Design a protein around this ligand. Structure first.
Ligand SMILES: [Mg+2]
Ligand SMILES: [Mg+2]
Ligand SMILES: [Mg+2]
Ligand SMILES: [Mg+2]
Ligand SMILES: [Mg+2]
Ligand SMILES: [Mg+2]
Ligand SMILES: [Mg+2]
Ligand SMILES: [Mg+2]
Ligand SMILES: [Mg+2]
Lengths: 218, 129, 88
RNA sequence: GUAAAGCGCACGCAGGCGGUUUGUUAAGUCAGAUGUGAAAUCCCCGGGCUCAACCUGGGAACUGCAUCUGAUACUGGCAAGCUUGAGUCUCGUAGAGGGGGGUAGAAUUCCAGGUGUAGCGGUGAAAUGCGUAGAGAUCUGGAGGAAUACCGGUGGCGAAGGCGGCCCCCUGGACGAAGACUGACGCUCAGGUGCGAAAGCGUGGGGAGCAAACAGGAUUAGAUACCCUGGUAGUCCACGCCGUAAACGAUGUCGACUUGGAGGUUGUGCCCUUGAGGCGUGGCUUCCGGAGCUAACGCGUUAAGUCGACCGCCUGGGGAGUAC
């Protein structure tokens, strides 16, 4: 947990009496994530991902926040590991049956622009269909190749991706989040108290967990 | 004012288990402790202890299990201003046996099954199931 | 409330010894003071209802105090009454 | 809480309940036993009428009352203490808390006079009304009554009602601090006692402004109203009476536990106090809100959450808080 010296705590004094059992201190007002009890869960919790991850574990990564977003793609795309960094959809998991309809569309429409099959129609209806991918791939992208609910799941911070967490446990999908102070851990079965952001805190555990998920498959 | 010390212990306990509080404290006394000993030798709390020298304390450590606390139901019975005394064959059966009823017998603060098998009645105290 | 002098003074006079204001007998006397004195303040004005509260309160307290004495020591009780010319 | 329902609030007798340790007792409490608890019913097992209803053998039951023998944890009696409950003291703390007496300035109206001239006032317009007997406006002097701009607020005090200028006098309560002291002296309380907004009633004062009544004027189909011009009671005062209010947090009192965040109020401990600055830690008080509670709204450590002691009240709507 030596590397842990690059994220420490966060959040001034809003916190939540639920994350209290995970606070090192509160210097200069802002609390301090108890890195000491974070280490146990660092591995133990992380190890569990490797489990299902072994059998093409569809580990779905989440995080729409500025920092994470642009990075989530890299960390997750490191393998079968799916991800979503563009605002969670209402039912993209639970309403998969109906949400997938967009996936199919995105796919076929994607091929439209792929080979000689998109070039035609008036610039209007022609360019109109371009827009779709310009957005559909934004959210359906890191899931278009997914064939049903993910083997598991993994989100950066639950307090922001609340919607995602709910759809998961509602379907019966394990949750691994790195919520810090101001966050409800009860919504996660594998809590990892750590800065909800931090340039390092994000990329760190991102690829760190991706390892036992991509490099962890035998 | 504290017209019923017994209840407090019981109330304190249930509230704790619901508050996920590790243990609990309170000004112990003869009965208070004796009662706690029943909760201990039965299985409802981690343990208990009487701190303080001139001022009695009580380290009634609450116990928990899986995704829930142990004591799921604990209320008063022989409350004051309405004391209840029952005979041997007149002893209740908390949760068809799954639970217990702390009773004050002429021998000691036993349990429903206990005092009952011994063959004696006694003032109930609570139905900590 | 009461004159610092007369206060401490009246204490030593009934205290079980010295510097024991909490003393039972002491309370009565010390209380009877403002009681027997307020009479004047109340004799005048009269419509000083709010102030009456304090009187009536401390008044009842004397009773609740004397009853105790008579319950945990009939001796001192029967005595204090005399020196204070109480009981009708 | 809003459905029926928290007494307007206090104080407190009876009554109910009673922190803590030991000894003692053994009344309640438990156990054992002996009486008595009629038989028949009821119940169980078993018989007799071809069965059943029915009749019957035995037992159980008879929840009970008493006596005797014990058991002593718990309630109770007693004796002895204890200190955390309550209270006493010392010292401070803030305050529209109360009764009494003063007192200042701002304005209103009225009176007198100077100046000045044809309006003023009022409304949606008006009109009544006040003005040449000189108003209004303006200035000077004076008379008097009621209320205290600003400070002032999510503020403070109080049992409730309620309480704002300043000054003094008499006076009650709340809070913190360190401690010193008494030693369970406590909580609650039917009846009872006392306090009770405004309006109202009595006697005698006072009376500027406002204003039920009443009187005009206008509005309107009408307008016993809203609006305008006047104006009596009253409002103010002293003592007495009346006891009601959406007397409302529509939420009885006392005690104990149950995550948090934000802010006001006042006390106290500490920090280069070098600062108002910072940290704590008491009482009070707003706002948001979790768990839980709720029919929902919502309440939420000031609960309507989780418990305990005591009290009040509710039992469909109308008739009716009416009659007697
Ligand atoms: Mg109604
Ligand atoms: Mg009602
Ligand atoms: Mg009330
Ligand atoms: Mg019989
Ligand atoms: Mg005893
Ligand atoms: Mg009046
Ligand atoms: Mg009058
Ligand atoms: Mg107050
Ligand atoms: Mg709230």
């Amino acid at each position: 947990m030596l590397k842990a010296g690059v994220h420490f705590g966060h959040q001034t004094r809003y916190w939540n009496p639920k994350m209290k059992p995970f606070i090192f201190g509160a210097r200069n007002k802002v609390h301090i994530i108890n890195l000491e009890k974070t280490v146990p869960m660092f591995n133990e919790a992380l190890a569990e991902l490797n489990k299902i991850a072994s059998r093409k574990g569809k580990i779905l990564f989440v995080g729409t926040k500025r920092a994470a977003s642009e990075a989530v793609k890299d960390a997750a795309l490191s393998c079968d590991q799916f991800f979503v960094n563009h605002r969670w959809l209402g039912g993209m998991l639970t309403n998969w049956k109906t949400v997938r309809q967009s996936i199919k569309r995105l796919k076929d429409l994607e091929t439209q622009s792929q080979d000689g099959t998109f070039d035609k129609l008036t610039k209007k209806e022609a360019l109109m269909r371009t827009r779709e991918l310009e957005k559909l791939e934004n959210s359906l992208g890191g899931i278009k190749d997914m064939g049903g609910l993910p083997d598991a799941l993994f989100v950066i911070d639950a307090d922001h991706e609340h919607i995602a967490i709910k759809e998961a446990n509602n379907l019966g999908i394990p949750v691994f989040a790195i919520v810090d102070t101001n966050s409800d851990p009860d919504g996660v079965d594998f809590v990892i108290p750590g800065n909800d952001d931090a340039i390092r805190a994000v990329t760190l555990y991102l690829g760190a967990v991706a390892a036992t998920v991509r490099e962890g498959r035998s | 004012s504290m017209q019923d010390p017994i209840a407090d212990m019981l109330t304190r306990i249930r509230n704790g288990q619901a508050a996920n509080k590790a243990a609990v404290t309170m000004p112990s006394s003869k009965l208070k402790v004796a009662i706690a000993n029943v909760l201990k030798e039965e299985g409802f709390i981690e343990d208990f202890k009487v701190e303080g020298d001139t001022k009695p304390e009580l380290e009634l450590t609450l116990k928990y299990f899986q995704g829930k606390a142990v004591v799921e139901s604990i209320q008063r019975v022989s409350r004051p201003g309405l004391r209840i005394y029952k005979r041997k064959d007149e002893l209740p059966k908390v949760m068809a046996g799954l639970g217990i009823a702390v009773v004050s017998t002429s021998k000691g603060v036993m349990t429903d099954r206990a005092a009952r098998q011994a063959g004696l009645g006694g003032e109930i105290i609570c139905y900590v199931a | 409330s009461l004159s610092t002098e007369a206060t401490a003074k009246i204490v030593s006079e009934f205290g079980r010894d010295a510097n024991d204001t909490g003393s039972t007998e002491v309370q009565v006397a010390l209380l009877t003071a403002q009681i027997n004195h307020l009479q004047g303040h109340f004799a005048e004005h009269k419509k000083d209802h709010h102030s009456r509260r304090g009187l009536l309160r401390m008044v009842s307290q004397r009773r609740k105090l004397l009853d105790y004495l008579k319950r945990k020591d009939v001796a001192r009780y029967t005595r204090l009454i005399e020196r204070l010319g109480l009981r009708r």
